């Protein structure tokens, strides 16, 4: 079955360069004309790159012209794509897409490229407690703040994912440099503290790991 | 090259109703226009491609239409999993897209939950000290949060974030950071914050002091 699937984005300084991948599977891979189309983070679509489906023809828009590369390894069932001179306005999620036909039918999930001078940073993680009972009847919320990692992203859980339903965990907002997220749960009152109720935090680009638990007096 | 303005950025729309999206091209396009459907963690789903012929396995709640250089877009029966951003596409020369459509759904209004929390030991420790206020599951998604220090207003130093529509119940969640310097957070005694929102005519206050425990 029709599979694309990206890889290789990351996270790349001002002026500096990348090469992403997309791998096919489940057709004839060297006889499709094939693109990459990027998200931008305000959620615009972008046609970035087109290549026909023996590698002889190829189109870029005036944007990324003489910055971007698409390529093609036909035997290896793979697209590339070869950036160089990367500006901020570059940062987006990249799609593989396979075009058969004049628009889009199908596509890859994606793979993220984040153009910055800021440096790699793990997160700080701190308890989000009520304390003095100052407010707790029936259900009561405990939260976990992340800060100060660079770059996105964090993966937030609660009690190593037993606790699921009563989660919000909020898009992070960068400051200057760097991240800030934060994250609630709601527990019923008589299972806390009670039971425990801990927020786990994986950073991949530093490769942490951090549990906090929430201890019941933050005041 | 060849522009697509796509007319509604944003919308909000009950179950059971109709929406519609306008997607107007710089020049004749010849009925070469597609729509997607963009979710999420997904790739864009095709929904119509020629103007108007549905992909196969697209609900027929779904329809466009349009000619020469104007375009519609239309769901009919408005169902939950409809949320979504959604792209109309030209491809009679080169490729370009709308800037697109978020469409979110109607609720009966709801009001936050309010929530503060005092700054952690171990941020303290650090030299740092947020205060965190949670607004959650409340609807419309337009909402206001006011930190006070000691009773005046303060704006710098803090971050708001806000989610989108909850898949589960059609609310909203937001919240809301102030972070000080820890010398700066003991010059001071009460830290409030203030949801103002249509379900009530007075605001949730609520508040800490460093004042026990």
């Known amino acids: 079955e029709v599979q694309l699937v990206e890889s290789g984005g990351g996270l790349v300084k001002p002026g500096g360069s990348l090469k992403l991948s997309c791998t096919a599977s489940?057709?004839?891979?060297?006889?499709?004309?094939m693109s990459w189309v990027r998200q931008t983070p305000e959620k615009r679509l972008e046609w970035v790159a087109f290549?026909?489906?023996?590698?002889?023809?190829?189109y870029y828009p005036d944007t990324v012209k003489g910055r971007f590369t698409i390529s093609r390894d036909n035997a290896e069932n793979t697209l590339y794509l070869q950036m160089s001179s990367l500006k901020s306005e570059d940062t987006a999620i990249y799609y593989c897409?396979?075009?058969?036909?004049?628009?889009?039918?199908?596509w890859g999930l994606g793979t993220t490229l984040t153009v910055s001078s800021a440096k790699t940073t793990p997160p700080s993680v701190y308890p989000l407690a009520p304390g003095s009972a100052a407010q707790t009847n029936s259900m009561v919320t405990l939260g976990c703040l992340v800060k100060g990692y660079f770059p996105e992203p964090v993966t937030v859980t609660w009690n190593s994912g037993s606790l699921s339903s009563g989660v919000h965990t909020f898009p992070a907002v960068l400051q200057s440099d760097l991240y800030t997220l934060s994250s609630s749960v709601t527990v019923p009152s008589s299972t806390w503290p009670s039971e425990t109720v801990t927020c786990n935090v994986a950073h991949p680009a530093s490769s942490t790991k951090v549990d906090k638990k929430i201890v019941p007096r933050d005041c | 090259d060849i522009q697509m303005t796509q007319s509604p950025s944003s919308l909000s729309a009950s179950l059971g109703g109709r929406v519609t999206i306008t997607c107007k091209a710089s020049?004749?396009?010849?009925?070469?226009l597609a729509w997607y459907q963009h979710k999420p963690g997904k790739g864009p789903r095709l929904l119509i491609h020629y103007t108007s012929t549905l992909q196969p396995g697209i609900p027929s709640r779904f329809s466009g239409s349009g000619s020469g250089r104007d375009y519609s877009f239309s769901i009919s029966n408005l169902e939950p999993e409809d949320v979504a951003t959604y792209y109309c596409?030209?491809?009679?020369?080169?490729?370009?897209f709308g800037a697109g459509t978020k469409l979110e759904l109607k609720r009966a209004d709801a009001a936050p939950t309010v929530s503060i929390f005092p700054p952690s030991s171990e941020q303290l420790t650090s030299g740092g000290a947020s205060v965190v206020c949670f607004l959650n599951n409340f609807y419309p998604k337009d909402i206001n949060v006011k930190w006070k220090i000691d009773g005046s207003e303060r704006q710098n130093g803090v971050l708001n974030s806000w989610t989108d529509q909850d898949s589960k119940d059609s609310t909203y969640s937001m919240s809301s950071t102030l972070t000080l310097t820890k010398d700066e957070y003991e010059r001071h005694n009460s830290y409030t914050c203030e949801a103002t929102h249509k379900t009530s005519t007075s605001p949730i206050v609520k508040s800490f002091n460093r004042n026990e425990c």
């Open positions: 290549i026909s489906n023996g590698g002889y023809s190829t």
């Open positions: 020049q004749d396009i010849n009925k070469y």
């Open positions: 596409l030209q491809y009679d020369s080169l490729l370009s």
């Open positions: 489940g057709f004839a891979f060297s006889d499709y004309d």
């Open positions: 897409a396979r075009q058969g036909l004049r628009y889009f039918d199908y």
